mmCIF file of C-alpha atoms and ligand atoms in Angstrom:
data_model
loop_
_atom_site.group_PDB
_atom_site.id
_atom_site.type_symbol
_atom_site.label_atom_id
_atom_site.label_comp_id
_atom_site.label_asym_id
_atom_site.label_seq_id
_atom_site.Cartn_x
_atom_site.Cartn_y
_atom_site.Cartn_z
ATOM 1 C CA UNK A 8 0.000 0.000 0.000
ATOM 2 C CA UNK A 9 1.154 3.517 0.706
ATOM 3 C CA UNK A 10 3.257 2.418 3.462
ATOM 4 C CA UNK A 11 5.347 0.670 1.692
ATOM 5 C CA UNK A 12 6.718 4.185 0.729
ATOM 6 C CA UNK A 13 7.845 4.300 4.616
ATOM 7 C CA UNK A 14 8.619 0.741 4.925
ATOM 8 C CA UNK A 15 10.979 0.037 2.466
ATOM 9 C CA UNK A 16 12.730 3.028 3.725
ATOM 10 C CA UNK A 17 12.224 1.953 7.961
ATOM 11 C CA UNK A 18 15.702 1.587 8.013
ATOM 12 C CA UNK A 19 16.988 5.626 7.177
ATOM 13 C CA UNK A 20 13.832 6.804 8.974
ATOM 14 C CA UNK A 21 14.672 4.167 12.247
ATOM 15 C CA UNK A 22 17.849 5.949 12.203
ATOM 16 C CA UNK A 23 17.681 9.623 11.516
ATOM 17 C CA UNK A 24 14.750 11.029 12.780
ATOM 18 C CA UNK A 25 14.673 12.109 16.430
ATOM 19 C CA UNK A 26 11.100 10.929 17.032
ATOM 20 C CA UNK A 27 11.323 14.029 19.558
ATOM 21 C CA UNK A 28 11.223 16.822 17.303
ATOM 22 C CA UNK A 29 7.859 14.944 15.345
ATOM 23 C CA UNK A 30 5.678 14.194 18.014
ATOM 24 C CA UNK A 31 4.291 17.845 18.818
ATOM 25 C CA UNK A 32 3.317 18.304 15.290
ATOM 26 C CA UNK A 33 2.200 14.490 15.053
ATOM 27 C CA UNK A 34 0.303 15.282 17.983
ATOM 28 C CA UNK A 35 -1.094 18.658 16.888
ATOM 29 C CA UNK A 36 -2.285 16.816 14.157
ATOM 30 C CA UNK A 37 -3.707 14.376 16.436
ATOM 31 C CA UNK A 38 -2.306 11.045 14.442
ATOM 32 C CA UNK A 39 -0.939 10.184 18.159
ATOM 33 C CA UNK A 40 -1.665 10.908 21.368
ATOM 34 C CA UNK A 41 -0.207 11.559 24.510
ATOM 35 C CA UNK A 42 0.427 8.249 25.497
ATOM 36 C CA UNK A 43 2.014 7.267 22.249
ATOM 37 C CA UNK A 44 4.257 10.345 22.612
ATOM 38 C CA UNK A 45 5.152 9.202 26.025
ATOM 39 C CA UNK A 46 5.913 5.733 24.456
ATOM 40 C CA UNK A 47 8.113 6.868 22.237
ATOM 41 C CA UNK A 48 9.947 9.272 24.359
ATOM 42 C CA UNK A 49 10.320 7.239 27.271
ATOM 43 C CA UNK A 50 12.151 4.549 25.799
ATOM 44 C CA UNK A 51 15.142 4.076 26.648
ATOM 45 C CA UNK A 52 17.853 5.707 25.146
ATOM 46 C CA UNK A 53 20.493 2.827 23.704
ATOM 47 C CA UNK A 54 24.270 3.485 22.677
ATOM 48 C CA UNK A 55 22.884 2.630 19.188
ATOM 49 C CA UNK A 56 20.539 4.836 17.959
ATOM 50 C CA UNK A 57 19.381 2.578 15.071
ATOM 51 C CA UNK A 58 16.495 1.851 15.813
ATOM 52 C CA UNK A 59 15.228 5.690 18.024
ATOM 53 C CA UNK A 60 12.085 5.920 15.475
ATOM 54 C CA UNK A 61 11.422 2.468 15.263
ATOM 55 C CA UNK A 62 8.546 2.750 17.915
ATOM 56 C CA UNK A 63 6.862 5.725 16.266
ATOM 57 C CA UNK A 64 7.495 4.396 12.585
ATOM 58 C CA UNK A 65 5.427 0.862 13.905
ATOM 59 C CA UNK A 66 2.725 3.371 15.902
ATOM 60 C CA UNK A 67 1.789 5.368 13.010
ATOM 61 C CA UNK A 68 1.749 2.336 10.554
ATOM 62 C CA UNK A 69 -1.745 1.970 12.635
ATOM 63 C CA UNK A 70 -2.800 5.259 11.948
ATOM 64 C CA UNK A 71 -4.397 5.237 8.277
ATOM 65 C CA UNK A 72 -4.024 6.986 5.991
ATOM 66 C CA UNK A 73 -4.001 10.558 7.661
ATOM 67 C CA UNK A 74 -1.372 8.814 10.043
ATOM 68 C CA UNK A 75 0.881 8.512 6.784
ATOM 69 C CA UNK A 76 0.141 12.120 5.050
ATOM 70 C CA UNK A 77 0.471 13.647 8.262
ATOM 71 C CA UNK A 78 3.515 11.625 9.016
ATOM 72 C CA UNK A 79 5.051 12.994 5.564
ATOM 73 C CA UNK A 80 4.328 16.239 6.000
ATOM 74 C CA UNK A 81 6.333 16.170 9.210
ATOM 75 C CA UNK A 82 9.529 14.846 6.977
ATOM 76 C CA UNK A 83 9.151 17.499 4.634
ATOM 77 C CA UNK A 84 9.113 20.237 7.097
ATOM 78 C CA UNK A 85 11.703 18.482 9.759
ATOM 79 C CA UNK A 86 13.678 16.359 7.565
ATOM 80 C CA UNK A 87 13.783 17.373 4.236
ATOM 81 C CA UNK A 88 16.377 14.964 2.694
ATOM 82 C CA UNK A 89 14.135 12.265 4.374
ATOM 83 C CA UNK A 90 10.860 13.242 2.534
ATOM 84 C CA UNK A 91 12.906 13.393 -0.790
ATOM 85 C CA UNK A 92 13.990 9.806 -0.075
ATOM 86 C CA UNK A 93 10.483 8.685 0.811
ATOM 87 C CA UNK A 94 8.518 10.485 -1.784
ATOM 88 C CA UNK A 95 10.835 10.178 -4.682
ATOM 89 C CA UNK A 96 11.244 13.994 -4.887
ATOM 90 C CA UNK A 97 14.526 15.064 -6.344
HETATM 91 MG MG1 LIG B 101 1.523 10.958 29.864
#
């Protein structure tokens, strides 16, 4: 489906994004909640930061469809080189 837009790339996305600076707009937009924000803030911070998004990426695959536009719009204003990877953009 769409997804698989974000999937095939879970593994820059994992990685790059600091779920931290998405979750008040995510929020805002309310495709999570406070209790998902709290999920994915209070995990525990690892020496590898592989997988830091991992727990937001599998939260908002639950989301729909808004969970995924919303989700995109928050890489093209937070991490632009991310949305161009995602999206195809050049
Ligand atoms: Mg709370």
């Amino acid at each position: 489906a769409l997804w698989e837009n974000v999937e095939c790339n879970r593994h820059m996305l994992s990685r790059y994004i600091n779920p931290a600076k998405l979750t008040p707009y995510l929020r805002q937009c309310k495709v999570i909640d406070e209790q998902d924000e709290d999920e994915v803030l209070n995990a525990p911070m690892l020496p590898s930061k592989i997988n830091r998004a991992g727990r937001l990426l599998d939260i908002l695959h639950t989301k729909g469809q808004r969970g995924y536009v919303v989700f995109l719009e928050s890489l093209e204003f937070y991490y632009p080189e991310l949305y161009k990877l995602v999206t195809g953009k050049e």
